[PDB]
Amino acid sequence: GAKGDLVSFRIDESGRAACVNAVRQKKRATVDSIKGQFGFLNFEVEDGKKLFFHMSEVQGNTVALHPGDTVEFSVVTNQRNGKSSACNVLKIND
């Protein structure tokens, strides 16, 4: 079976600037809602555009990230559509 073991060497929540999707633009907010494989954070980018993310950007397991929980993400603006998305979603405790 697959063991989802971790290594105490490199994690994103440690402030990984060396690798990142958005230009040092890791934002932190709370999950507003989650729909199937997609989540939304309480971060309105434009006119009330709720920040969306896919469960693939989620921390490890798709069932490990819950709505109403604090998360860390990276807000990358779609230069094509104008909206943004959360990439590299980490579980945050508060």
76: Cα separation from own chain's centroid? 11
Beta carbons of 30 and 68 less than 8 angstroms apart: yes
Within 8 A by CB and 6+ apart from 27, the residues are 43, 72, 73, 74, 75, 86
Paired with 72 in beta bridges are: 28, 90
12-91 folds as OB fold (Dihydrolipoamide Acetyltransferase, E2P) (2.40.50)
| Separation CA 45–CA 83 (nearest Å) | 7
* Domain coordinates in residue numbering, the chain: 12-91
The method recorded for this entry reads NMR
Please provide the DSSP assignment of 5-18 as one string.
---TT--GGGT--S
Sign for the CA dihedral angle at 59, 64, 65, 68 comes to negative
Instruction: List C-alpha distances in Å: 87 to 11, 14, 55, 73.
Output: 15, 16, 10, 6
| Separation CA 45–CA 82 (nearest Å) | 9
Q: What are phi and psi of 67, to 5 degrees?
A: -65, 135
Give burial (CB, 10 Å; 0-12/13-18/19+) of 73. Answer: buried
